[PDB]
Amino acid sequence: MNAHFANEVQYDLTRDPSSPASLIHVIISSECLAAAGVPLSALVRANFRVETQTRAHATGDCTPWRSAFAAYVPADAVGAILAPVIPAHPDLLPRVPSAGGLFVSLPVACDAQGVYDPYTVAALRLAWGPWATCARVLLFSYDELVPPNTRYAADGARLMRLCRHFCRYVARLGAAAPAAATEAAAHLSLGPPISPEEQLTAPGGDTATAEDVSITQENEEILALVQRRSLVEWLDRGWEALAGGDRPDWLWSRRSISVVLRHHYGTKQRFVVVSYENSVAWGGRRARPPRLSSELATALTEACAAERVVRPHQLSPAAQTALLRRFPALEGPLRHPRPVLQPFDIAAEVAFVARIQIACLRALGHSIRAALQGGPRIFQRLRYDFGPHQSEWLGEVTRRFPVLLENLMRALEGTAPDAFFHTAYALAVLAHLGGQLVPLSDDIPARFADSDAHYAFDYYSTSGDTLRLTNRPIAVVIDEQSKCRFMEGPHRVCEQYLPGESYAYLCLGFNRRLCGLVVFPGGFAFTINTAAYLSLADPVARAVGLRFCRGAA
Amino acid sequence: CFEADIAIPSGISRPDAAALQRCEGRVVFLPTIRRQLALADVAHESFVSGGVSPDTLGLLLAYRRRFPAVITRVLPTRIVACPVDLGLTHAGTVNLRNTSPVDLCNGDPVSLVPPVFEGQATDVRLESLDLTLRFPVPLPTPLAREIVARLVARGIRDLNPRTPGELPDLNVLYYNGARLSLVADVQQLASVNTELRSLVLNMVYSITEGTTLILTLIPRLLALSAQDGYVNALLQMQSVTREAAQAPMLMQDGERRLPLYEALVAWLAHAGQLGDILALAPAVRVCTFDGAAVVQSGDMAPVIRYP
Amino acid sequence: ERAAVLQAQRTAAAAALENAALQAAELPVDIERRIRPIEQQVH
Amino acid sequence: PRYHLTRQVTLTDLCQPNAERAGALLLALRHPTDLPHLARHRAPPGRQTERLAEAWGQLLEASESGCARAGLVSFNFLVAACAAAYDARDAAEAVRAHITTNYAGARLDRFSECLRAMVHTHVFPHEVMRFFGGLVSWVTQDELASVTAVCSGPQEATHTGHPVTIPACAFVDLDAELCLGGPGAAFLYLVFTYRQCRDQELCCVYVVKSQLPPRGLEAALERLFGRLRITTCTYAAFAELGVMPDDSPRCLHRTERVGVPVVILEGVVWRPGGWRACA
C-alpha cells in the first residue's frame, strides 16, 4: 500500500530533470518470483530496498542503480487493497483469498510529449544482503508493463458493496459500535463476499464513453417517443470510528481503483498493473497530461504487419525511412553497423550477456593452452610438507590429472551465465574492466585494489562430480616459495581452508591484474596470463561495466 | 540536597584514591535517582552502547537521557552526589569545578559539553576497577552554542564528499582571541542523522503563512548596507543574504488574523529553539559572592539554579 | 547462445498469447450492447 | 520554606470542594472572563470565530461575575467532560457518575461544548486553567467558596503527607508509561493530547508516569502516540506536575468519597513547572 505511496514521494521530486517521467504500480505475485529464482522464505522474514536501473533496447548506456522501496506481504495482494484489515475490525470486509507478493511501483522513461519506447528494459534487483549470491535480476519491457487503458469499471461494483458492508457490520454487531459508527451505517442504506479475482476476469475496462452516450441517447429517444453530502463522506466516519484515525493508506481504498492483469514475457507468468485515482503515477486521475503514447507499439508493428515483414531488418528501404521520417529515435536499431545490443530481438539483453559468457571462456580456454603448451615444469609455488606415505596420494594425482581440466571448463560451460556472475572470475574481470569503478554487490574487499598479491579464489570439487563448492569468492593473500594468508571478515562447509591445502579441492584464484592461479593440492600451482587473451572491446565493454558497476559514495 | 550516595565498590589503587580527591566539583552522569548505586553505570563503559561507543554528537544524545550530578564530598567509602535535576535547592550554592581553557565571566549560564578539546581530554584511568572516565567540560552557553552547530555541520559534510579536499575545517574557534582547535576523528551517522532531522523538521514549522511577506524585504536589507555602520556589520560576508539578492501573492482570506504577528510566533517556536533541542539544557549559572568578575581555570565557582 | 534466445523469444510468444487472449476477451463482449437494447425499440 | 499556604476566593459554581475529596488536583481559572477576544485572534480565518463568543457564555449560564470570580476548577471537571472525547468510554464515563451525583452535568454539558469549541478556533486549553494545588482546606461558605489549596513546591504533599494522599481520580488516568520497570523516583506531568479535525478537536486530560527528564520527555512525547494524523499543529502541550520522589507508593483502588477507580500517590515534590506547545 504505502510502498506504492512513498515511491510517489520520490515521484514528487525531479522538478525539472533530464527527462520527464511516469510511474507504474506493478504487483508481482508468488510464482512469478518463485519461477524467477527468488526464495520466498527469505523475503518473508515491510519496507525493503530495491536497486533498479533502466536499459535501452537498441544502443546506449544504462541508468545507475536507484534505491527504491518494496512491500512484500504474503496475502491476497489484490484483495488486501480491496478488503483492508482494521486491527479492531478485521471482518469489516470478508473476501476471497489469492496469491501475493511484493508491492513495488516502477518509474518510466518518457519524452517531451512522451512516446514510450517498447522493448526497452527496466531491471530490478532484490538484495537479500550484500553478496551477489544474495541477489537476483529481473527483466521488464514496457510492452510487458504498459496497458493502453485500465479497468476502473471493476471499481463500480466494489464501492457500493463497501456501503452495504457498513450496512452489514453494524446490524450484526449492534450496540457495540460507538456513536460515530452507528450513524454512518444507515446513511449508506438510503443510497456475498467480495472476490478480488473477478475484477481481473470480468471483461470490462475503460472507455471514453462520449461515443457511448450518443449511442444511448439515440437508443432511449425511441423509448421516450413511444412513452409520449454523498455516500463517500459517510465512508470517512465509517473508517474514523472503526479505526479511530485517518490512515492515508486506506484513503485510496475508498477512491477509484483499477486492477489490471498482464503477463510476463520471460517465464510465462502473470502480474498486476495498478492505478488509483489520486495517484500522480500513471493511470491516476491527478497526473500531468504529457504521459505515454502507444505510437511506437503501433508504427513498427503495422508497418511490418500490413507489409507482412516478419523481421524489420527485412523491412523495405522506403518502408524503413518513412518510419524514420515519422519517429526519429529508430536510427539506432535500424542504421548502426554493429550495435553492442542486438536490434529487434526479445532476448537482446540476454544475448548481450551470453556473448560475455562465451568471450571469457575462449579467453580462458586459449590461455589454459598457453601456459600448458608442451610438457610443463610447474615445480611448486606453496609450502606444504608431507608425511612419508602421503606421497602415494599424489601417485593418484599423476594419474587423476588431465580429466579435471576438461571438466572444469565443462562446468564453466555447465553453469548458467546468470549463475556465473556470482563467481570470482566474473567479478575479478569487473575489477579489471573497472581498471581499464566499483563492481556490483561489493564482494570485493577494501584491500583487493591495493596490490596484485591480493587474489580471489573459487573452489571446485576434485573427486566424484567436478562441482563448485562455494558461494563466496574467498580472497586469500599470497606472498620461489610463498606461504598463504587470509583476509579479514550463513555457514558453508569448504570455506575454512587455505587454497591447495588438502585433497579433494581445486583452487582457482584471480587478480585485478587478471593474472590468475590454478592451485592444486601440494604447492603445485602456476600463474596464467589471461590478460594476453582477454579481448574485450571497450565500447562493447562500456555497456557491460555500467550495468555491473556501482558508484561508491 | 536530597542526598544521593555512590559507594566505593571494590578495592582501591592507592594513588587513584587521591585521583578521586581532585575530582571534587566535577559532574557524574548517573541515569537514575538512587539512595545508593554502584559505580558501574558511572563510567564511559556505560556510555558505550551495545558494541559501539558514541561520537561527540552521540555523547550529546547519550548525555540527553541521563542525569548529571555534582560531586559534593569525597569519602573513602562513598561519594555523595547531589541530583542537579531536582536537588538544586541550595542557598549554600553547592560548588563545581571549572575544567575548561576559557576564563568565563560572572553571570554566564553554564551548560555541559563532552570532552572534545584537543588538550583537555579529562581522561583519568582506574585499573583496579577497570573503568574509563570522561568528565564533561563546563562552558559558557553562547560559546557552547557555537560548538554544537559546528560538529553537526561537520557531520553534514560526512554525508556528501563533490567538493575538493580543502574544506573549511569548522575547527578554529574565537573567544576575544584564543584560537581553539578541536578533535575531528569519527562521525557516527545515526547521531548525525537524528540531529540533522530535528534541524530540518523544526525549520519546517518555523515558516508560516504571514512569514512570506518578510521575504519581500530582502532587497530592502541591502539598502541599509551602504548608509550606516550597524547594518553593514550585521550583514555577514559569508552569508546567503548577500548572495540571494542577485510578491504578496495575494490569496487574501479575511485579513483579520494579524498575519505578520502570527509569523514571529511559530518561527520563535522552533527556529527560536535550536540550541537546546540539539544540546543539553543549561541549568548552571555563574554566581560568585566575593565580587570576583571572572573564575579561573581550575577554580571552584559557586553554582546557582536554572537561568 | 542461440538456445537461450530461441527459448526467451518462445516464452515471450507464449506470454503474448494471454497478452492477446485477454485483449481478445472483448470479441464476444463488444456486440451485446450494440444490438440488444435496439431491437425492443423496433418493437 | 517547605511549608506554604495559598488562598483564592471563588464560587462553588465550579468544583464545589465540599462535594470533592480531601485530595483533588485543582486547576485555577486564570483569565476567567477572557476568550471572546482570542476566539477572534490567533486562528486562520477558516474557523468561523463567532463560536467561543457564545460557548463560554453558555458555560457561566450553568456556571454575572460580581466580586467572586469564576475559578478553582476541579480535576474531575475535565476528565468526565472529555470522557466522551478520548479513547476510554464507560470507564472514563464513571467520572461523570462521580460529578453529576456529587457536584452536575449542566455545567459539564456547556463545557464539553467548550472542549469542542475552544480547540476549534485554536484557543487551546493549555495556559488557561493553570495549576493551583491539592485542596488542603475548604473554609468555603454554603453557595460561595474560600479554599486554601497550596501551590509552591513539595510542601503540599508533606503537609498532606505528615497527615489527602493525591488521587489520580481515574485508573484510565495516571497513564502507566514506562512498563520497562525499574527503581527510582516518579516525575509527574500534565499533558493535553489533541486530535485536530480528525476526531473533530479532541480534548484529553491524563497524567503520565515516568522517571524521565524534560529533555527525555519531548521525544517521549513524539513516541508512543497514535494521534499524529493531523497534517493543524501545536498538539500535546505539557507542564511539570512535579516529582513523586518514590515509585513504591503508587496504588490501585476503586473506592472514593459511585464506584470510581482511583490511584493513591503518597508523597510528592510539587514542582509547578512550565508549559510548552510548538509542534
d(CA D178, CA D185): 12
Cell of A4: 506504492
Do residues A70 and A104 touch, judged by C-beta distance below 8 A?
Answer: yes
**DSSP code per residue over A66-120:** EEE--BB--S-HHHHHHS---SS-GGGS-B------BEEEEEEE--TT----TT-
* CA D150 – CA D3 distance, rounded (Å): 9
Ramachandran category for residue B173: left, alpha or beta (phi over 0 → left; psi -120 to 50 → alpha): beta
Residue carrying the nine cell digits 479532541: D202
Q: By C-alpha distance, which of A142, A199, A163 is closest to A22?
A: A142
Cβ(A136)–Cβ(A112) below 8 Å? no
At residue A72, what are phi and psi to the nearest 5 degrees? -90, 105
The CA-based diameter of chain B, rounded to the nearest angstrom, is: 77
The answer to whether B and C touch (≥3 CB pairs < 8 Å) is: no
- Determine the Cα–Cα distance for residues B148 and B192; give it in Å rounded to an integer: 11
Given D84, D89, D229, which is nearest A245 (Cβ)? D229
Alpha carbon A525 to its chain's center: 40
Go through D13-38 and write b for each residue having 16 or more CB atoms within 10 A of its CB, e for each that does not: bbbbbebbbbbbbbbbbeebeebeeb
Whose grid coordinates read 531536582?
B86
Phi/psi at A368 (nearest 5 deg)?
-65, -40
Cβ-contact A368, A409 below 8 angstroms = yes
- Say how many residues make up chain C: 43
- Compute the distance between CA of residue A299 and CA of residue A327 in angstroms, rounded to an integer: 9
Could you tell me how far CA D270 lies from the centroid of its own chain? 15
Give me the resolution in angstroms, 1 decimal.
Answer: 5.4
Secondary structure of A389-421 in HEC code, one letter for each residue: CCHHHHHHHHHHCHHHHHHHHHHHHHCCCCCCC
Under 8 Å between Cβ of D51 and D117 = yes
**Which DSSP string corresponds to A9-78?**
HHTT--SS-SS-EEEEEEEE-HHHHHTTT--HHHHH--B--EEEEEE-SSSS-BPPPEEE--BB--S-HH
Taking CA–CA distances from A249, the nearest residue in chain D reads D229
A324/A334 Cα distance (integer angstroms):
9
Which of D90, D229, D230 to substitute to test the interface with A, most A CBs within 10 Å?
Answer: D229
- AA letter at D223: R
* Residues in CB range of A488: below 8 A, 6 or more apart: A445
Nearest alpha-carbon partner for A273 in A103, A33, A25, A99: A25
C35 touches chain A (CB under 8 A): no
Query: How far is A87 from A243, CA to CA, in rounded Å?
Result: 8
Q: A248 CA to chain D: closest CA distance, Å?
A: 9
Q: Helices A296-305 and A317-326 meet at what angle, rounded to 10?
A: 160
Beta carbons of A347 and C37 less than 8 Å apart: no
Does residue D208 sit in helix, strand or coil? strand
A453-483 burial: b if 16+ Cβ within 10 Å, else e: ebbbbbbbbbeeebebbbebbbbbbbeeeee
CA distance A245 to chain D (A): 7
Distance CA B81, CA B5 (A): 6
CB atoms near residue A129 (< 10 Å)? 10
In the beta sheet, which residues pair with residue B133?
B124
Q: Which residues contact A343 (CB under 8 A, 6 or more apart)?
A: A57, A58, A313, A332, A333, A334, A336
Q: How far is CA B103 from CA B98, B106, B113, B173, B208, in A?
A: 9, 10, 16, 15, 41
**CA-CA distance, D22 to B124, in Å (whole number)?**
54
A268 touches C: beta carbon within 8 Å = yes
User: Cα–Cα distance between A59 and A343 in angstroms, integer?
Assistant: 8
What's the CA angle centered on D172, arms D170 and D175, to 5 degrees?
110
Q: Which three cell numbers stand for residue D52?
A: 467561543
**Yes or no, beta carbons of C15 and A268 under 8 Å apart:** yes
Rounded to 5°, angle at Cα A255 from A30 and A20: 75
Residue A537: CB partners within 8 Å, gap ≥ 6?
none
H helix and E strand count, chain C: 2, 0
Q: What separation in angstroms does the CA of D11 have from each of A168, A318, B4, D58, D113? A: 51, 100, 45, 17, 21
Which subunits count as partners of chain C given 3+ CB pairs below 8 Å?
A
Measuring CA to CA, which residue among D30, D250, D12 is closest to residue D138?
Answer: D12
Both ends of chain C: CA-CA distance in Å? 67
The dihedral region occupied by D117, where left means phi > 0, alpha psi between -120 and 50, and beta the remainder, is alpha
Q: What are phi and psi of A412, to 5 degrees?
A: -65, -35
Task: Measure CB to CB from residue D198 to each of A178, A179, A246 and give the nearest one.
Answer: A246
| Rounded Cα gap, residues A552 and A17, in angstroms | 22
β partners of residue A528: A516
Q: Which of D127, D215, D270, D271 would best serve as a mutation to test chain B binding (most B beta carbons within 10 A)? A: D215
Q: Which of A291, A333, A324 has its CA nearest to residue A116?
A: A291
- The reply to whether residue A219 touches residue C19, judged by beta carbons under 8 angstroms, is no
Q: What angle do CA B167, B169, B170 make, to 5 degrees?
A: 125
Q: Do D87 and A244 touch (CB under 8 A)?
A: yes
Q: Chain B: nearest CA to D32, how far in angstroms? A: 23
Q: Which residues of A touch D93 (CB under 8 A)?
A: none
Q: How far is B257 from chain D (nearest CA, A)?
A: 6
Close Cβ partners of A146 (under 8 Å, ≥ 6 residues apart): A24, A108, A116, A118, A273, A282, A292, A294
Kindly list the residues from chain D whose CB atom is less than 8 angstroms away from the CB atom of residue B197. Answer: none
d(CA A101, CA A33): 8
Q: Which of A490, A372, A361 is nearest to A426 (CA)?
A: A361
Q: CA-CA distance, A105 to A122, in Å (whole number)?
A: 12
Residue D248 is placed in which grid cell?
513504591
Cα-flanking dihedrals φ and ψ of residue D133, to 5°? 155, -160
**Among candidates D84, D89, D198 on the partner chain, residue whose Cβ is nearest the Cβ of A245:** D198
| A151 in Cβ contact with A440 (< 8 Å) | no
Per DSSP, the three-state class of D210 is strand
SS3 state of residue A298 = helix
Q: How far is CA A465 from CA A72, A405, A458, A520, in A?
A: 38, 13, 16, 17
Q: Please give the torsion angle defined by the CA atoms of residues A379, A385, A387 and A393, in that order, rounded to the nearest 10 degrees.
A: -40
Cβ–Cβ contacts within 10 Å for residue A353, how many? 20
Give the residues across from A516 on adjacent strands. A528
Residues in B 194-213 with any Cβ partner in D closer than 8 A = 202, 205, 209
B193, three cell numbers: 542523522
Coil/strand/helix, residue A240: helix
d(CA B66, CA D43): 39
Q: Look up residue A404 and give its three cell numbers.
A: 579435471
- The cell numbers describing A231, all together, are 455516500
State whether C12 and A346 contact (CB < 8 Å).
Answer: yes
How far apart CA A102 and CA B291 sit, in angstroms, is 72
Instruction: State which amino acid sits at residue B302.
Output: P
Could D198 and A178 be called an inter-chain contact, meaning their C-beta atoms sit closer than 8 Å?
no
How are beta strands B78-83 and B36-37 bridged, if at all? unpaired
Q: Which residues of A touch D229 (CB under 8 A)?
A: 245-248
Q: In the structure grid, which three cell numbers stand for residue D259, read together?
A: 464506584
Specify whether the CB–CB gap between A460 and A508 falls below 8 A: yes
Question: In terms of Cα–Cα distance, which of D30, D131, D115 is closest to D75?
Answer: D131
User: By the 8 A CB rule, do D80 and D95 touch?
Assistant: yes
- D41 vs B259: CA distance, rounded Å: 10
Cα Rg of chain D, angstroms: 18
Question: Among partner residues C8, C9, C25, which is closest to A203 by beta-carbon distance?
Answer: C25
From chain B, pick out residues whose CB is under 8 angstroms from the CB of D126.
none
Contact A455, A476 (CB under 8 A): yes
Cα distances (angstroms) measured from residue D199 to each of A119, A239, D195, D208: 51, 11, 6, 22
| Dist CA A20 CA D16 (whole Å) | 69
The DSSP line for chain B is ---EEEE--S---TTHHHHTTTTTT-EEEESS--SEE-STTTSHHHHS-SSS---TTHHHHHHHTSEEEEEEEE-SSEEEEEETTT----TT---EE--SSS---SS-EEEEE---BSS---EEEETTTTEEEE--EEEEHHHHHHHHHHHHHHHHTTT-----S----S--B-SSS--B-B------HHHHHHHHHHHHHHHHHT--SGGGGGGGGHHHHGGGGGG-SHHHHHS-SSSSTTTTT---------S-S-HHHHHHHHHHHHTSS-STTTSPPP-EEE--SS--S---TT-EE-EE---
**Which residue in A81, A75, A95 sits closest to A192, CA to CA?**
A95
Please tell me which of the candidates C4, C25, C41 has its beta carbon nearest to residue A223.
Answer: C41
Task: Provide the grid cell at A353.
Answer: 550477456
Angle (nearest 5°) at CA A82 between A76 and A84: 80
Helix (H) or strand (E) holding A205: none
Cα A433 from chain centre? 24
Task: Tell the residue number behind the cell numbers 536537588, with chain if given.
Answer: B87
- Helices first, then strands: H and E counts in chain A: 19, 16
Closest CA to A447 of A481, A476, A421, A426: A476
Asked if A358 has any chain C CB less than 8 Å from its own CB, the reply is: yes
B124 contact partners, CB below 8 Å, separation of at least 6:
B19, B23, B133, B135
Distance (Å, rounded) from C-alpha D98 to C-alpha D254?
12
